[PDB]
Symmetry: C3
């Protein structure tokens, strides 16, 4: 139950330099492998930089706030090149960048194919993150994956709002349980059925021997609207009631 | 009124293998065309794989939940290569992947340039989606587009919250319609004017010959704040009232 | 306090044509520079088109609504090629595209390395934006950056909702300040502590010599739930009260 970010095409990648396009970030996913034909080159089984120094990197980013729980790195699949240590940097706001664990130099790879995995406890909370190779065998060449928490069912909800009143004397007389319905139409139709939350912002009602009785509920909710059922009981005379409603659509 | 996803640069793409960088996913949009100069190669008018088998794919992804309504595929513009059938797979959570229509093998292209379009009824609801070529003429080479519903006006709203009370005896005496205003300042200024929803969470008020009368409304809403107007009428003495407010900014 | 979009890997890029993959959009960030080795080509210090006409472009996009505040362009770092003027187009819905400032032809570069910056007042509000070169020295070749407002702390909140009542006669007798607590468990645990907004949707209560007194508040809020404290005072007998709650989690 972690998300493989690169495997799912969830992040944009950007390297400092590329040896050429046949060594670009597009070739960098963990376990990347291509044709084992030696007579025709189809690209490195890695990102490989052009410049060899301590200033190269790949940035991975997108708009969403991610909770990164691990990173895995690997050397290059088709030649003896691998990153032996690296630093990490990240940003939540895309303005201020932070050094992971005070600029910790993480021990990394020692061969082409063995995976080295570092776990983040607590998760790194970030929009963008950058791997910064510090040392290497032969060339700055790597494959990698970033692991994040899945998105919660409750995130990114859609919302519409409005108000509803009795607007007449429908509940202003009589005895026992008495109800009226006001049908509400959402300004725009939802793609799935929302929930509808309500809160009273006007009471104009008479007590019944000192007892106040009123209720509202949302019912019969559809993509297009819902019913506000206004309720009184005993012998209360309710002159008017008003609710604000907040309709919330999830997972869409 | 559908959105052309690749045309709008809305999705990250990732292929299994590329013949080389000059045949990568960057060349895969429907109707992609480049220089018709035969003396200098500027890349294939297609994505083309490196390995030829039944295991190649392109994944298209981003963080947002998309409602995919169609897919179009095409062969390669500058050579006789095209995909003749394919399967589709998708994921909503980026953990669990689903086979489209029980692993349906979709009949696809028979030439370089004719478009073949499949419509999804109901839409495929997904964060990432993958085209998996099964058979081909000459090479696994294609162009394509994914079509999605546009984003609703009501999605991804911004929210700020707080509470407001009378806090004094301003409405606790007198006759007829009586009102007071409490100006509220949002903790942070909005980029556009929000709506402001309210709900009562405290009443401390005297009836007027048994009649209860109170109201709140939000008014004079700006990017910076709003006015909670507290209202009573008849001869009611209102000691205190409290509302929670929810301010919602759309389309920003 | 603006965000450098390409530097942070925040946008997908898509060109009309590329001279080849070694001249693609991946080489287009402002101040892009690679190996100054003349004996081995590692790609142009620019995006460069393949076709030379007035119809080439790069589209930059993602799902989020961005407020673009500036654009900077530069020519090519390693050869005498630069764009001398261009037009801009953008879209908020990814269906309807708009010409910036009525199709204004913007004066651009006159050398390899000097930066030319245009500021947008008001910001361009858009999901995708496209630079459309009109004239050029030698070739359509450029580097660039797009600048946007940072995301507000209040955007993309997570939400859960529910209702809570006294459900018994706990507050229906006695004298002075009397309170009861109902512990509420969120259907799903949050990653950080939310706020909890409330609004009354049922009153069943007796006045005390004509005075109505009731209150609710949310307290002891955690990732897992909160306490609704129901309150009365004086000599009021409260039979039942019901609140809808809206719990909002920010910045996650
Ligand atoms: C069924 C019915 O009317 N029930 C009410 C109850 O809700 C409450 O208001 C009470 C106050 O003494 O009076 C009655 O028992
Ligand atoms: C204008 C005015 O005071 N209107 C009120 C009305 O709102 C309601 O409370 C009624 C109850 O009998 O008493 C009056 O008519
Ligand atoms: C402490 C206490 O009971 N205060 C109350 C106050 O809240 C209000 O209801 C008032 C009405 O005359 O009666 C008392 O003073
Ligand atoms: Ca190979
Ligand atoms: Ca060509
Ligand atoms: Ca160079
Ligand atoms: Cl009364
Ligand atoms: Cl009341």
């Amino acid at each position: 139950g972690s998300v493989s970010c690169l495997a799912n095409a969830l992040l944009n990648l950007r390297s400092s330099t590329d040896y050429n396009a046949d060594h670009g970030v597009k070739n960098s996913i963990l376990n990347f492998s291509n044709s084992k034909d030696a007579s025709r080159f189809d690209g490195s089984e890695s990102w490989s930089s052009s410049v060899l120094d301590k200033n190269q990197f790949i940035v991975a980013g997108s708009d969403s706030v991610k909770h990164f729980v691990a990173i895995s790195t690997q050397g290059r699949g088709d030649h003896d090149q691998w990153v032996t240590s690296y630093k990490l940097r990240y940003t939540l706001d895309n303005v201020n960048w932070v050094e992971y664990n005070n600029g910790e130099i993480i021990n990394a790879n020692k061969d082409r194919n063995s995976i080295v995995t570092i776990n983040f406890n607590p998760p790194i909370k970030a929009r963008s993150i950058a791997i910064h190779p510090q040392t290497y065998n032969n060339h700055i060449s790597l494959r990698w994956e970033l692991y994040a928490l899945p998105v919660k069912s409750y995130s990114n909800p859609s919302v519409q709002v409005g108000e509803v009143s009795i607007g007449d004397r429908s509940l202003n007389s009589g005895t026992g349980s008495r109800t009226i319905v006001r049908h509400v139409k959402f300004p725009v139709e939802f793609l799935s059925v929302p929930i509808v939350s309500i809160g009273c912002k006007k009471v104009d009602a008479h007590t019944d021997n000192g007892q106040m009785r009123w209720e509202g509920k949302s019912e019969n909710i559809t993509t297009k609207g819902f019913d506000l059922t206004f309720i009184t009981w005993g012998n209360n005379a309710v002159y008017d009631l008003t609710f604000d409603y907040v309709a919330v659509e999830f997972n869409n």
